[PDB]
Amino acid sequence: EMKVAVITGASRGIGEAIARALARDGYALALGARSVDRLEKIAHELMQEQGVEVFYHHLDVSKAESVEEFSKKVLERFGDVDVVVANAGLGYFKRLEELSEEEFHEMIEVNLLGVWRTLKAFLDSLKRTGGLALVTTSDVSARLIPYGGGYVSTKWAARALVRTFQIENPDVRFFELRPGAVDTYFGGSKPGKPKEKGYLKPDEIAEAVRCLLKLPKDVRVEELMLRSVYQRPEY
Amino acid sequence: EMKVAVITGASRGIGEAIARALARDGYALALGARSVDRLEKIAHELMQEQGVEVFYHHLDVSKAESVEEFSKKVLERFGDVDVVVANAGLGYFKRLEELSEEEFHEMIEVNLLGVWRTLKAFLDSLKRTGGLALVTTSDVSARLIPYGGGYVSTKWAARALVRTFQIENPDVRFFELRPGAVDTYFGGSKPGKPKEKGYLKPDEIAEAVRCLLKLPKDVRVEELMLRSVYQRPEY
Amino acid sequence: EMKVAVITGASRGIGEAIARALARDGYALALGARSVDRLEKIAHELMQEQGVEVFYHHLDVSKAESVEEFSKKVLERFGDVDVVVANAGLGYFKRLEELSEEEFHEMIEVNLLGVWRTLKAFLDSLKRTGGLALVTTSDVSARLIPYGGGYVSTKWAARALVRTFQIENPDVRFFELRPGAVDTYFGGSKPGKPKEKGYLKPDEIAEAVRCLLKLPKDVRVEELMLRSVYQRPEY
Amino acid sequence: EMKVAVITGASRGIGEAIARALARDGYALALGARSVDRLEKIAHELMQEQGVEVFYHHLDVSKAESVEEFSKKVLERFGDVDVVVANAGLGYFKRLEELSEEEFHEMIEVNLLGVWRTLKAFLDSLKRTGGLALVTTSDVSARLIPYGGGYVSTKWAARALVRTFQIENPDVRFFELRPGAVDTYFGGSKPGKPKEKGYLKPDEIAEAVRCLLKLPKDVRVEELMLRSVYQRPEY
Ligand SMILES: NC(=O)c1cc(O)c[n+]([C@@H]2O[C@H](COP(=O)(O)OP(=O)(O)OC[C@H]3O[C@@H](n4cnc5c(N)ncnc54)[C@H](OP(=O)(O)O)[C@@H]3O)[C@@H](O)[C@H]2O)c1
Ligand SMILES: NC(=O)c1cc(O)c[n+]([C@@H]2O[C@H](COP(=O)(O)OP(=O)(O)OC[C@H]3O[C@@H](n4cnc5c(N)ncnc54)[C@H](OP(=O)(O)O)[C@@H]3O)[C@@H](O)[C@H]2O)c1
Ligand SMILES: NC(=O)c1cc(O)c[n+]([C@@H]2O[C@H](COP(=O)(O)OP(=O)(O)OC[C@H]3O[C@@H](n4cnc5c(N)ncnc54)[C@H](OP(=O)(O)O)[C@@H]3O)[C@@H](O)[C@H]2O)c1
Ligand SMILES: NC(=O)c1cc(O)c[n+]([C@@H]2O[C@H](COP(=O)(O)OP(=O)(O)OC[C@H]3O[C@@H](n4cnc5c(N)ncnc54)[C@H](OP(=O)(O)O)[C@@H]3O)[C@@H](O)[C@H]2O)c1
């Protein structure tokens, strides 16, 4: 009955919330992010309050060697994984002619290459377990926004990447999670922004994920798009 | 705390399963389909076993006057509705040059116009309650299949219709439900087909819907696509 | 060297313009629309001024029997056809709850079923000639507009229909033509509206089509989307 | 009457063919690629045979400083430009778990960032001239192929990028060119492959582009997708 979920970008925001939600269902957790202090704090709480096993380890998804070491340590700790949540991501918002090389490169390294690295590192394991890879892209993985050129392009790329992984690995389930705006640290912000300004809360997203992950193993949830009623419905 | 859900195509298949799932969460239900015998049977069971209120009434979504009378009777019974599940649908599968006028027309009347009629009939009510309209389209609302020309075209139309309703009514939540193949009577079949042949089971879809409908009222689930792991992942 | 093009909605607007453009390249033409007076007028002019053969015949694409008789007469006149332009279409623009049954039905009968009827009637002929079926859908075959629910849904359907025809008939070339707003009689208007209000001119669209149709027979133009620089770029 | 077209990836393949086609219409040309020997050869021929002005200069679109110097030299040579063809691109084809960091990075640098750099470098100029930016993406900018994960993801990104440029700069025309397979050096191949194996020829693509570029300045061709009849129609 014991299942193992790996979560990237677990130190805050959506990733943290998903960790907390899956802990409620008794998942063992492997948490990765650059802020190891945050991971430790979350881990100790979940271990004691939810009675689950938690492993955490430094992870920078922009670095090939970091992802490889992280996956090695996770697989060593738990054996094969059942769920991989490739959630780490970031956004800089500027007109395309104003966006810097540095900003564009960072979004590519995390939102696209980071996802690719995360999924390929755990792919053999998921194939064995008929597991589930959930990737947090964005509602903008299939639409456009002004000032979003760099960010949006990487999320469109991530959507193609996930679907290609799916075609190439029909023994694994790939789940594209497409939230609208969420009240996190995303975009250089901080949590505490009211729903009415057009924000979902991370715990809401995490509850949607948790209950969908309760579906039988032969159900493949491929796409979920959800936004605040206070976010204008744009396509 | 009492919420009311209206379900079309409630006599069997996905619609019936959604009715049963929402009954578990204590929804009052208004059931519509052409098979009133089936509706009565389902209703009596849910009333006694789940302790919910159930109203049922003949509904043929291919007829404007039937949908109008159905909505009148439902609103009279319950007052305003909180959830409307526009689920009735059907498919004939033939090469486009073989598909008959009759077959194409029926799919249009149910899959597209039936959805339109259902949503407009309850639209004022949903606007008042900040309610949720869930439309069962199909995974093929955004992809193509051979032999599916007539059916697919109506589901593409239904997707545009739902999104347009959403743009035009930002005070209402519209949820496009996109199942792959499901083991029902759909396509001239009968339930009992094994998952391994590439079928989801209706109760699985209904559980996904039920737990998503538990999200707070200010969360707008816009799209969910899910299929059997035994269905080839095609886009 | 003599090629035959069939054009529906040839009495005015884009269809007329395409007829005129193809006449410049020496196509024999078969023209269909309900306004036979208009067809005769266009035909006599093109015959004398462009030296091409022109056949015209009453065609109401909303009626199965009309399309069948039209195709019979065209094939009798010319033998097999090389190009079929399924261009007839219309739009009513209203919020979805205001759109009438009559309006929605007419758009379905012309924009979707009319296209289906036109293509299936000439399909065997095009298969023999490795011919080209061009369907005038709209830029809104893949996007949404307020007030466009009925119209847009039929164009989304038409796009699925065309692509399905293509999959099912890889020996024929299918070309989806997606103009933005064009200065015609479309939408209850009349020609003469200035480009600056956001309109392409029919002769511009027709020139784009004509020069693309000059490509070798083994080139399959599948999609062309074009709009006025004065139309806001929306996706 | 004299117009100036800048073409990247002009040393061979589609870029070269576009240069030759636009020369036939009397465009002055600015050619960029890494193979300056090839550019010189093409330039001398077009100058003498087509009587057009041709400027060429080393360009590596994977390097920010190269694109900036190239644009500086082009604008110095000609003044403002009327057409910018961002065509340079490449593909490596492997399952996603086999694709190397090096391969993925190169495709990103050329297919996505190279396009971004090219367009932003000439953006002020195009804004002044109400010019046209044509980007050669691919038919796979909106579909998936096995072994294409890295390549496809960059083309999906490029499509989002182009559309975002368009939204942000409605005074400029952006044209997404989406060829299927073409007989070039693409994919580590060489020209000479027969059409029947599923290849368009570069001169065909270039003719499609040339005749569309003859449309009046207030016509905005946004998308053209074309493939060989010998390429299976996939979406
Ligand atoms: N919030 C929204 O509005 C919105 C809208 C939307 O449509 C999509 N989404 C998408 O949701 C996902 C979660 O973002 P979210 O939770 O909202 O943002 P935030 O609170 O900033 O937490 C970011 C987490 O990522 C981690 N992280 C960052 N870089 C890393 C690296 N190199 N290596 C490893 N980890 C890295 C970072 O950890 P740390 O490394 O310790 O700094 C942190 O845990 C992203 O894909 C969004 O694109 C959001
Ligand atoms: N099963 C799949 O594989 C699959 C795959 C996919 O991608 C999408 N979906 C979509 O799922 C939805 C539910 O269909 P599903 O449950 O799978 O099919 P089935 O067991 O045949 O029950 C049909 C129900 O509709 C009702 N109904 C029919 N006509 C009616 C009318 N005129 N007026 C009112 N109701 C009418 C009919 O009731 P009755 O009137 O008494 O005969 C019955 O309750 C459809 O939208 C599909 O397109 C399915
Ligand atoms: N103009 C735009 O803005 C815009 C924007 C866009 O995105 C897409 N498009 C699409 O372009 C195509 C051509 O329309 P367009 O040229 O702009 O419109 P208009 O000047 O009204 O001429 C309509 C022609 O159709 C014919 N026709 C009508 N019903 C018929 C029937 N039952 N049977 C046979 N024919 C029928 C009618 O002939 P008649 O039968 O004699 O009355 C006439 O020749 C349509 O698909 C649009 O959806 C337009
Ligand atoms: N052929 C197909 O099948 C197919 C299918 C499809 O769907 C899309 N397309 C897309 O068509 C476009 C043209 O490619 P194509 O003509 O078919 O390929 P090829 O014959 O290899 O010539 C490549 C040209 O790019 C240049 N170039 C390369 N790197 C460069 C750099 N860093 N900086 C500057 N330039 C660079 C290179 O020049 P050089 O620098 O001297 O080596 C050469 O001139 C690409 O976007 C494809 O993705 C193709």
Side-chain angles (χ1 to χ4, degrees), chain C residues 93-114:
Chain C
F93 296 88
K94 283 162 197 195
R95 291 180 51 88
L96 278 171
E97 80 280 3
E98 291 294 322
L99 185 70
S100 76
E101 289 274 347
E102 290 75 14
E103 289 166 328
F104 212 157
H105 276 96
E106 190 175 15
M107 290 188 285
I108 290 159
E109 287 295 348
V110 180
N111 299 348
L112 175 60
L113 295 178

PDB file of all heavy atoms in Angstrom, chain C residues 93-114:
ATOM      1  N   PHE C  93     -24.586  36.868 -35.505  1.00  0.00           N
ATOM      2  CA  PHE C  93     -23.783  37.199 -34.348  1.00  0.00           C
ATOM      3  C   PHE C  93     -24.631  37.722 -33.200  1.00  0.00           C
ATOM      4  O   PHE C  93     -25.209  38.807 -33.264  1.00  0.00           O
ATOM      5  CB  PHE C  93     -22.670  38.164 -34.741  1.00  0.00           C
ATOM      6  CG  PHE C  93     -21.702  37.564 -35.704  1.00  0.00           C
ATOM      7  CD1 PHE C  93     -21.933  37.630 -37.069  1.00  0.00           C
ATOM      8  CD2 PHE C  93     -20.590  36.874 -35.245  1.00  0.00           C
ATOM      9  CE1 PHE C  93     -21.051  37.055 -37.963  1.00  0.00           C
ATOM     10  CE2 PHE C  93     -19.702  36.296 -36.134  1.00  0.00           C
ATOM     11  CZ  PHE C  93     -19.934  36.385 -37.494  1.00  0.00           C
ATOM     12  N   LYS C  94     -24.711  36.904 -32.162  1.00  0.00           N
ATOM     13  CA  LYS C  94     -25.507  37.200 -30.984  1.00  0.00           C
ATOM     14  C   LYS C  94     -24.956  36.393 -29.834  1.00  0.00           C
ATOM     15  O   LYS C  94     -24.328  35.347 -30.041  1.00  0.00           O
ATOM     16  CB  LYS C  94     -26.968  36.814 -31.211  1.00  0.00           C
ATOM     17  CG  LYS C  94     -27.709  37.798 -32.075  1.00  0.00           C
ATOM     18  CD  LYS C  94     -28.968  37.225 -32.652  1.00  0.00           C
ATOM     19  CE  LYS C  94     -29.428  38.102 -33.806  1.00  0.00           C
ATOM     20  NZ  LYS C  94     -30.820  37.819 -34.199  1.00  0.00           N
ATOM     21  N   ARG C  95     -25.189  36.874 -28.620  1.00  0.00           N
ATOM     22  CA  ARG C  95     -24.889  36.083 -27.439  1.00  0.00           C
ATOM     23  C   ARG C  95     -25.613  34.745 -27.563  1.00  0.00           C
ATOM     24  O   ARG C  95     -26.692  34.663 -28.156  1.00  0.00           O
ATOM     25  CB  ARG C  95     -25.306  36.827 -26.169  1.00  0.00           C
ATOM     26  CG  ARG C  95     -24.454  38.043 -25.868  1.00  0.00           C
ATOM     27  CD  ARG C  95     -24.930  38.732 -24.603  1.00  0.00           C
ATOM     28  NE  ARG C  95     -25.067  37.778 -23.503  1.00  0.00           N
ATOM     29  CZ  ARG C  95     -24.088  37.445 -22.668  1.00  0.00           C
ATOM     30  NH1 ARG C  95     -22.886  38.002 -22.778  1.00  0.00           N
ATOM     31  NH2 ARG C  95     -24.313  36.552 -21.720  1.00  0.00           N
ATOM     32  N   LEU C  96     -25.005  33.691 -27.029  1.00  0.00           N
ATOM     33  CA  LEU C  96     -25.550  32.347 -27.198  1.00  0.00           C
ATOM     34  C   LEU C  96     -26.983  32.162 -26.706  1.00  0.00           C
ATOM     35  O   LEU C  96     -27.736  31.369 -27.271  1.00  0.00           O
ATOM     36  CB  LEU C  96     -24.630  31.313 -26.548  1.00  0.00           C
ATOM     37  CG  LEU C  96     -23.439  30.911 -27.421  1.00  0.00           C
ATOM     38  CD1 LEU C  96     -22.464  30.062 -26.640  1.00  0.00           C
ATOM     39  CD2 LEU C  96     -23.937  30.169 -28.645  1.00  0.00           C
ATOM     40  N   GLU C  97     -27.367  32.888 -25.662  1.00  0.00           N
ATOM     41  CA  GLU C  97     -28.724  32.759 -25.142  1.00  0.00           C
ATOM     42  C   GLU C  97     -29.745  33.539 -25.979  1.00  0.00           C
ATOM     43  O   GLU C  97     -30.955  33.358 -25.819  1.00  0.00           O
ATOM     44  CB  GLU C  97     -28.797  33.146 -23.652  1.00  0.00           C
ATOM     45  CG  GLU C  97     -28.860  34.637 -23.367  1.00  0.00           C
ATOM     46  CD  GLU C  97     -27.507  35.337 -23.442  1.00  0.00           C
ATOM     47  OE1 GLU C  97     -26.486  34.695 -23.771  1.00  0.00           O
ATOM     48  OE2 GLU C  97     -27.467  36.545 -23.158  1.00  0.00           O
ATOM     49  N   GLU C  98     -29.252  34.388 -26.881  1.00  0.00           N
ATOM     50  CA  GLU C  98     -30.110  35.183 -27.763  1.00  0.00           C
ATOM     51  C   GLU C  98     -30.227  34.582 -29.162  1.00  0.00           C
ATOM     52  O   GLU C  98     -31.201  34.835 -29.879  1.00  0.00           O
ATOM     53  CB  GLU C  98     -29.583  36.619 -27.880  1.00  0.00           C
ATOM     54  CG  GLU C  98     -29.704  37.441 -26.603  1.00  0.00           C
ATOM     55  CD  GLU C  98     -31.144  37.709 -26.208  1.00  0.00           C
ATOM     56  OE1 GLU C  98     -31.985  37.939 -27.104  1.00  0.00           O
ATOM     57  OE2 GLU C  98     -31.433  37.699 -24.996  1.00  0.00           O
ATOM     58  N   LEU C  99     -29.221  33.806 -29.564  1.00  0.00           N
ATOM     59  CA  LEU C  99     -29.232  33.174 -30.878  1.00  0.00           C
ATOM     60  C   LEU C  99     -30.466  32.277 -31.012  1.00  0.00           C
ATOM     61  O   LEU C  99     -30.774  31.514 -30.105  1.00  0.00           O
ATOM     62  CB  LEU C  99     -27.960  32.349 -31.073  1.00  0.00           C
ATOM     63  CG  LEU C  99     -27.724  31.702 -32.436  1.00  0.00           C
ATOM     64  CD1 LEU C  99     -27.419  32.788 -33.460  1.00  0.00           C
ATOM     65  CD2 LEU C  99     -26.578  30.713 -32.331  1.00  0.00           C
ATOM     66  N   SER C 100     -31.170  32.364 -32.139  1.00  0.00           N
ATOM     67  CA  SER C 100     -32.373  31.550 -32.323  1.00  0.00           C
ATOM     68  C   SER C 100     -32.043  30.167 -32.854  1.00  0.00           C
ATOM     69  O   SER C 100     -30.992  29.963 -33.464  1.00  0.00           O
ATOM     70  CB  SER C 100     -33.354  32.232 -33.284  1.00  0.00           C
ATOM     71  OG  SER C 100     -32.926  32.109 -34.629  1.00  0.00           O
ATOM     72  N   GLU C 101     -32.953  29.225 -32.619  1.00  0.00           N
ATOM     73  CA  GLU C 101     -32.873  27.904 -33.235  1.00  0.00           C
ATOM     74  C   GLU C 101     -32.692  28.008 -34.751  1.00  0.00           C
ATOM     75  O   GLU C 101     -31.872  27.298 -35.338  1.00  0.00           O
ATOM     76  CB  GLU C 101     -34.137  27.104 -32.926  1.00  0.00           C
ATOM     77  CG  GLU C 101     -34.248  26.665 -31.472  1.00  0.00           C
ATOM     78  CD  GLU C 101     -33.540  25.346 -31.181  1.00  0.00           C
ATOM     79  OE1 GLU C 101     -33.159  24.631 -32.132  1.00  0.00           O
ATOM     80  OE2 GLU C 101     -33.375  25.020 -29.988  1.00  0.00           O
ATOM     81  N   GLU C 102     -33.458  28.893 -35.382  1.00  0.00           N
ATOM     82  CA  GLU C 102     -33.386  29.078 -36.825  1.00  0.00           C
ATOM     83  C   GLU C 102     -31.989  29.514 -37.278  1.00  0.00           C
ATOM     84  O   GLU C 102     -31.431  28.969 -38.233  1.00  0.00           O
ATOM     85  CB  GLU C 102     -34.445  30.092 -37.281  1.00  0.00           C
ATOM     86  CG  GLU C 102     -35.891  29.596 -37.181  1.00  0.00           C
ATOM     87  CD  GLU C 102     -36.445  29.549 -35.757  1.00  0.00           C
ATOM     88  OE1 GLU C 102     -35.841  30.132 -34.824  1.00  0.00           O
ATOM     89  OE2 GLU C 102     -37.506  28.922 -35.573  1.00  0.00           O
ATOM     90  N   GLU C 103     -31.426  30.500 -36.589  1.00  0.00           N
ATOM     91  CA  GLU C 103     -30.098  31.010 -36.930  1.00  0.00           C
ATOM     92  C   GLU C 103     -29.013  29.935 -36.772  1.00  0.00           C
ATOM     93  O   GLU C 103     -28.152  29.752 -37.642  1.00  0.00           O
ATOM     94  CB  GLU C 103     -29.778  32.236 -36.066  1.00  0.00           C
ATOM     95  CG  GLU C 103     -30.590  33.476 -36.428  1.00  0.00           C
ATOM     96  CD  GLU C 103     -30.518  34.576 -35.375  1.00  0.00           C
ATOM     97  OE1 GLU C 103     -30.400  34.268 -34.163  1.00  0.00           O
ATOM     98  OE2 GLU C 103     -30.589  35.758 -35.763  1.00  0.00           O
ATOM     99  N   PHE C 104     -29.050  29.224 -35.652  1.00  0.00           N
ATOM    100  CA  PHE C 104     -28.057  28.201 -35.389  1.00  0.00           C
ATOM    101  C   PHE C 104     -28.181  27.094 -36.436  1.00  0.00           C
ATOM    102  O   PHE C 104     -27.188  26.655 -37.026  1.00  0.00           O
ATOM    103  CB  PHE C 104     -28.228  27.638 -33.971  1.00  0.00           C
ATOM    104  CG  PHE C 104     -26.932  27.212 -33.321  1.00  0.00           C
ATOM    105  CD1 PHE C 104     -26.825  27.143 -31.937  1.00  0.00           C
ATOM    106  CD2 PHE C 104     -25.824  26.883 -34.092  1.00  0.00           C
ATOM    107  CE1 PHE C 104     -25.649  26.760 -31.333  1.00  0.00           C
ATOM    108  CE2 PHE C 104     -24.639  26.490 -33.492  1.00  0.00           C
ATOM    109  CZ  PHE C 104     -24.548  26.421 -32.107  1.00  0.00           C
ATOM    110  N   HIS C 105     -29.405  26.652 -36.686  1.00  0.00           N
ATOM    111  CA  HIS C 105     -29.614  25.605 -37.678  1.00  0.00           C
ATOM    112  C   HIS C 105     -29.099  25.998 -39.066  1.00  0.00           C
ATOM    113  O   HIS C 105     -28.485  25.179 -39.760  1.00  0.00           O
ATOM    114  CB  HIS C 105     -31.084  25.182 -37.729  1.00  0.00           C
ATOM    115  CG  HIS C 105     -31.449  24.164 -36.689  1.00  0.00           C
ATOM    116  ND1 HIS C 105     -32.005  24.504 -35.473  1.00  0.00           N
ATOM    117  CD2 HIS C 105     -31.307  22.817 -36.675  1.00  0.00           C
ATOM    118  CE1 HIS C 105     -32.212  23.406 -34.766  1.00  0.00           C
ATOM    119  NE2 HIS C 105     -31.796  22.368 -35.471  1.00  0.00           N
ATOM    120  N   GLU C 106     -29.337  27.242 -39.472  1.00  0.00           N
ATOM    121  CA  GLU C 106     -28.908  27.657 -40.803  1.00  0.00           C
ATOM    122  C   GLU C 106     -27.393  27.658 -40.916  1.00  0.00           C
ATOM    123  O   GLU C 106     -26.834  27.248 -41.941  1.00  0.00           O
ATOM    124  CB  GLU C 106     -29.468  29.024 -41.197  1.00  0.00           C
ATOM    125  CG  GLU C 106     -29.202  29.320 -42.670  1.00  0.00           C
ATOM    126  CD  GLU C 106     -29.828  30.608 -43.151  1.00  0.00           C
ATOM    127  OE1 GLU C 106     -30.243  31.437 -42.310  1.00  0.00           O
ATOM    128  OE2 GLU C 106     -29.902  30.791 -44.382  1.00  0.00           O
ATOM    129  N   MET C 107     -26.721  28.109 -39.866  1.00  0.00           N
ATOM    130  CA  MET C 107     -25.268  28.122 -39.898  1.00  0.00           C
ATOM    131  C   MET C 107     -24.726  26.706 -39.940  1.00  0.00           C
ATOM    132  O   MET C 107     -23.742  26.442 -40.625  1.00  0.00           O
ATOM    133  CB  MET C 107     -24.693  28.886 -38.712  1.00  0.00           C
ATOM    134  CG  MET C 107     -24.933  30.381 -38.809  1.00  0.00           C
ATOM    135  SD  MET C 107     -24.049  31.267 -37.525  1.00  0.00           S
ATOM    136  CE  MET C 107     -25.072  30.869 -36.102  1.00  0.00           C
ATOM    137  N   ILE C 108     -25.352  25.795 -39.196  1.00  0.00           N
ATOM    138  CA  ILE C 108     -24.940  24.395 -39.250  1.00  0.00           C
ATOM    139  C   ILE C 108     -25.145  23.814 -40.651  1.00  0.00           C
ATOM    140  O   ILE C 108     -24.261  23.150 -41.198  1.00  0.00           O
ATOM    141  CB  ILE C 108     -25.698  23.553 -38.201  1.00  0.00           C
ATOM    142  CG1 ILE C 108     -25.228  23.920 -36.786  1.00  0.00           C
ATOM    143  CG2 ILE C 108     -25.510  22.071 -38.447  1.00  0.00           C
ATOM    144  CD1 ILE C 108     -26.232  23.554 -35.679  1.00  0.00           C
ATOM    145  N   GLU C 109     -26.303  24.078 -41.243  1.00  0.00           N
ATOM    146  CA  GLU C 109     -26.636  23.496 -42.545  1.00  0.00           C
ATOM    147  C   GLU C 109     -25.706  23.949 -43.659  1.00  0.00           C
ATOM    148  O   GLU C 109     -25.424  23.184 -44.586  1.00  0.00           O
ATOM    149  CB  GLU C 109     -28.080  23.810 -42.931  1.00  0.00           C
ATOM    150  CG  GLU C 109     -29.126  23.033 -42.148  1.00  0.00           C
ATOM    151  CD  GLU C 109     -29.087  21.534 -42.393  1.00  0.00           C
ATOM    152  OE1 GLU C 109     -28.412  21.081 -43.341  1.00  0.00           O
ATOM    153  OE2 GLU C 109     -29.748  20.810 -41.622  1.00  0.00           O
ATOM    154  N   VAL C 110     -25.231  25.190 -43.570  1.00  0.00           N
ATOM    155  CA  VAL C 110     -24.374  25.750 -44.616  1.00  0.00           C
ATOM    156  C   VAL C 110     -22.895  25.580 -44.301  1.00  0.00           C
ATOM    157  O   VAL C 110     -22.141  25.032 -45.112  1.00  0.00           O
ATOM    158  CB  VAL C 110     -24.662  27.244 -44.862  1.00  0.00           C
ATOM    159  CG1 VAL C 110     -23.737  27.784 -45.952  1.00  0.00           C
ATOM    160  CG2 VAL C 110     -26.131  27.451 -45.234  1.00  0.00           C
ATOM    161  N   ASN C 111     -22.486  26.031 -43.115  1.00  0.00           N
ATOM    162  CA  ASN C 111     -21.066  26.079 -42.753  1.00  0.00           C
ATOM    163  C   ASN C 111     -20.454  24.717 -42.479  1.00  0.00           C
ATOM    164  O   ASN C 111     -19.253  24.527 -42.658  1.00  0.00           O
ATOM    165  CB  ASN C 111     -20.846  26.958 -41.518  1.00  0.00           C
ATOM    166  CG  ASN C 111     -21.278  28.381 -41.726  1.00  0.00           C
ATOM    167  OD1 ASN C 111     -21.553  28.798 -42.846  1.00  0.00           O
ATOM    168  ND2 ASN C 111     -21.348  29.142 -40.638  1.00  0.00           N
ATOM    169  N   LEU C 112     -21.276  23.782 -42.019  1.00  0.00           N
ATOM    170  CA  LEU C 112     -20.790  22.452 -41.673  1.00  0.00           C
ATOM    171  C   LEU C 112     -21.341  21.406 -42.631  1.00  0.00           C
ATOM    172  O   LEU C 112     -20.584  20.785 -43.379  1.00  0.00           O
ATOM    173  CB  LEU C 112     -21.140  22.092 -40.214  1.00  0.00           C
ATOM    174  CG  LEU C 112     -20.788  20.660 -39.790  1.00  0.00           C
ATOM    175  CD1 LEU C 112     -19.291  20.405 -39.929  1.00  0.00           C
ATOM    176  CD2 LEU C 112     -21.237  20.411 -38.349  1.00  0.00           C
ATOM    177  N   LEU C 113     -22.659  21.215 -42.627  1.00  0.00           N
ATOM    178  CA  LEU C 113     -23.255  20.177 -43.468  1.00  0.00           C
ATOM    179  C   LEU C 113     -23.108  20.501 -44.953  1.00  0.00           C
ATOM    180  O   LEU C 113     -22.876  19.605 -45.774  1.00  0.00           O
ATOM    181  CB  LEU C 113     -24.717  19.940 -43.099  1.00  0.00           C
ATOM    182  CG  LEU C 113     -24.900  19.366 -41.683  1.00  0.00           C
ATOM    183  CD1 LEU C 113     -26.368  19.182 -41.337  1.00  0.00           C
ATOM    184  CD2 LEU C 113     -24.143  18.049 -41.509  1.00  0.00           C
ATOM    185  N   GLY C 114     -23.227  21.778 -45.304  1.00  0.00           N
ATOM    186  CA  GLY C 114     -23.044  22.182 -46.691  1.00  0.00           C
ATOM    187  C   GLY C 114     -21.658  21.842 -47.205  1.00  0.00           C
ATOM    188  O   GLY C 114     -21.494  21.414 -48.350  1.00  0.00           O
TER     189      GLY C 114
END
